[PDB]
Design a protein around this ligand. Structure first.
Ligand SMILES: Nc1ncnc2c1ncn2[C@@H]1O[C@H](COP(=O)(O)OP(=O)(O)O)[C@@H](O)[C@H]1O
Ligand SMILES: Nc1ncnc2c1ncn2[C@@H]1O[C@H](COP(=O)(O)OP(=O)(O)O)[C@@H](O)[C@H]1O
Ligand SMILES: Nc1ncnc2c1ncn2[C@@H]1O[C@H](COP(=O)(O)OP(=O)(O)O)[C@@H](O)[C@H]1O
Ligand SMILES: [Ca+2]
Ligand SMILES: [Ca+2]
Ligand SMILES: [Ca+2]
Lengths: 313, 313, 313
């Protein structure tokens, strides 16, 4: 559980300015502790006089200094690996989708990217014993291709009350690139008033191929995309929630898998890349393209009327 | 072994001001001996009255005057060349990573930069007979892509106790440019209370492409980066420890290899540049871009589940 | 051979004050003869009473009055032109590096500035018949990029005993601007106890871009640099030794070649400027930017494992 921004009020910072820290999007103390000095002066009100003082006070409330690897080992061993819904993939991922980082699944059209995200939108409220996360979910949508009709079909596969499963998940369409980033600001708000566990952006680079569809602004197409993925990694180690993004890839304009999603400036954004491919048969393959800890391996899976599942045969 | 700042107390300097030398970041006597007169007056407390006196006393405790090349030859022949983990590269580097200077590996995405740094994070506590350094390690991380899961895999390749290997290494994430430089201050502290041998900044220019992502502050993007690489060369001849930084390079915003890492003001920062490139096959090549002593040569290597290794065939 | 300061003791000056002339840096009689009345009163001890008397006595010991051009012609024809190591450049320079003045080579990064200085650090102890100078050498270093590994490689190219070549050269790192100027004071000392022939400052303006890296002190960045180049021209006609400085230049903060090295107050410091540039091919060009006697011309050269050499083809 993070530390809300109200705890910083009693720490030595005024009240009229803490509300100003809020309007900038910062909702907790780690959000400012993970922020540089340059970003706080950009606020129209506050200046360098307080900015030194606030960041100094925030530093003590958030562990920021060095630490051992053993202490980081037993703390990294404790992160939740969200159940993928198919036992073959859990072994490929040594648990499943790992929270606190960016998970980027990219594959050709018709590969289950939309339904994998759907199945994950319910497997996250499963109890930890069931490999879940006991946390709320969120599914910001861009293609317009999300609908509860598939969610209750997966609740019955795992024995849940779909009446409350739809309550434990939120949703909003995205029409524009500026509305995609703006929606994260709102998203960053209600993640404080609750305990979400899985944000889903499907698809991330979808809306960037339609608005920024010119040849002169290829620079701006990535500058604006970088600012988007920045706050996404932001919200990942801020609330420690899993974030899963989606991309559509061509076989032969961030579509070439030879280049990462975060263009070149933020290319270190995605920490786990899963390439989804239809095999020679009617059976799907997930390939873990890059994840320092997990091998470059493969597994097979399939999709049923009840979500992601293991291969039939 | 350096000379701690406490030895300067008994040399003729007060106690309330030696604590002030500490708060400025100076932890030993060489740290002030390698400092100019301009930098000590910038302290809010002390003035030019003592600054002449302190630097005069520090001068005698640290060999500062001229010397012969023969005396520098046999003293430079004694520096440790950290074992790279692949025998082909030791010949390319005439030993491996040379301590007391800045080592900058830069290559395209997916080139082992992250895992080479990983393998070096254990090869440094090897005994000198095993080409190691018998010194602690440090891995300040920026991409978030570091994890012990690969370290114990390399300890078994060299026969070590991974339970203590993680104890002999420290680690901390970096989120902001101002937090990158601030973390060195803390780093400069616990390097006195122990004997580190290899600092690793991976990646150095990573966080400078995300915060300073505008067009007007291209000057400030390098001014702040210079102050970072300054203290890095600082800590290199201060404790005589090896410092290895990392950079991600585009094929076709310090990403063009035609320009050095330290922009233009501190461009003399990196003393050994190694360009990492995937060949026409599935085999990697390290090329020593610039190192006055080592030829502009090439070697091949590969990465396994147990760290950097020689080519399979 | 200069006249040491001890000869001034028997000339009519006391002993307790001649030691005071020493502590001020003045090691011979020309050093005070080339000094103004204003500079001697700045000493805490002596006053205008002796200052008139000392400078009057020093005047007779050092030829100071007028002279003909013929007498200056045959005396200027006798100055040594240090062999550059590449026959093409000797013709461009009508002999090579001319002693008794300031030689400033400036070029882009990766132009041989470091290795040209290296090759000159051995060509100076060559006998005069071999175009050398039969004098000791000195290489005060700032970038940290000097090492004997290249010196013995050039001794074998000219047939020398590298065991003694390193003895005939001295060296010291420079970390700060105040340590750069302070090192000249020591340098001015042991140049009396021996016969040096080539001082090398590589690079001169390097350390002035790191300490004086602010916007308010652009005045002080040159004031302090002027005091440095002052004593450098000082030591040039004092011991008549060659002094070669180095500068790193940007293509598009004394980096613009449109402005000289000595900023504006001492801009007459450098007497020969050589611009080093990588041509359209892998071959280097030296261009003599300014030298009243030598034409504005060009030549080509190259660098091998054995120092500066003529073009291969
Ligand atoms: N309700 C469903 N029940 C079963 N299979 C489905 C269902 N909807 C889609 N599929 C199958 O899953 C794939 C499409 O899933 P989807 O996640 O929408 O993929 P993508 O977004 O890549 O087009 C196709 O192979 C399709 O036959
Ligand atoms: N655990 C591992 N075991 C074996 N090979 C790995 C492992 N992790 C990554 N690799 C391989 O090494 C490269 C990635 O290494 P990494 O140091 O993370 O590179 P970079 O940071 O340049 O992306 C890829 O070729 C990948 O296949
Ligand atoms: N030991 C060496 N043997 C041969 N060529 C070298 C050697 N070291 C450097 N070079 C070459 O000389 C140039 C670098 O020389 P250097 O004097 O260090 O230049 P700069 O200081 O301008 O970077 C490059 O073209 C490099 O390929
Ligand atoms: Ca879809
Ligand atoms: Ca990396
Ligand atoms: Ca150089």
């Amino acid at each position: 559980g993070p530390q809300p921004i109200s705890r910083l009020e009693q720490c030595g910072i005024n009240a009229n300015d803490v509300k100003k820290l809020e309007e900038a999007g910062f909702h907790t103390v780690e959000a400012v502790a993970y922020a540089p000095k340059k970003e706080l002066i950009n606020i129209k009100g506050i200046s360098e006089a307080k900015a030194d003082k606030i960041l100094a006070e925030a530093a003590k409330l958030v562990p920021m200094g060095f630490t051992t690897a053993t202490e980081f080992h037993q703390r990294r061993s404790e992160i939740i690996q969200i159940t993928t819904g198919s036992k073959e993939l859990d072994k490929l991922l040594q648990g499943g989708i790992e929270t606190g980082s960016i998970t980027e699944m990219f594959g050709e059209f018709r590969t289950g990217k939309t339904q994998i995200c759907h199945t994950l939108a319910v497997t996250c409220q499963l109890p930890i014993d069931r490999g879940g996360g006991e946390g709320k979910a969120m599914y910001i949508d861009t293609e317009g291709t999300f609908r509860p009709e598939r969610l209750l079909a997966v609740a019955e596969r795992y024995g849940l009350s779909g009446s409350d499963v739809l309550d434990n998940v939120a949703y909003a369409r995205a029409f524009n690139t500026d509305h995609q980033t703006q929606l994260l600001y709102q998203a960053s708000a209600m993640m404080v008033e609750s305990r979400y566990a899985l944000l889903i952006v499907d698809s991330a680079t979808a809306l960037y191929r339609t608005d920024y569809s010119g040849r002169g602004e290829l620079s701006a197409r990535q500058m604006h995309l970088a600012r988007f993925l920045r706050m996404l990694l932001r919200l990942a180690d801020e609330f420690g929630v899993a974030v899963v993004i989606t991309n559509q890839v061509v076989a032969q304009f961030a579509a070439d898998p030879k280049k990462p999603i975060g263009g070149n400036i933020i290319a270190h954004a995605s920490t786990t890349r899963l390439y989804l491919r239809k095999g020679r048969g009617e059976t799907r393959i997930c390939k873990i393209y890059d994840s320092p800890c997990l091998p470059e391996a493969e597994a097979m899976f399939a999709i049923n009327a009840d979500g992601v599942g293991d291969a039939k045969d």
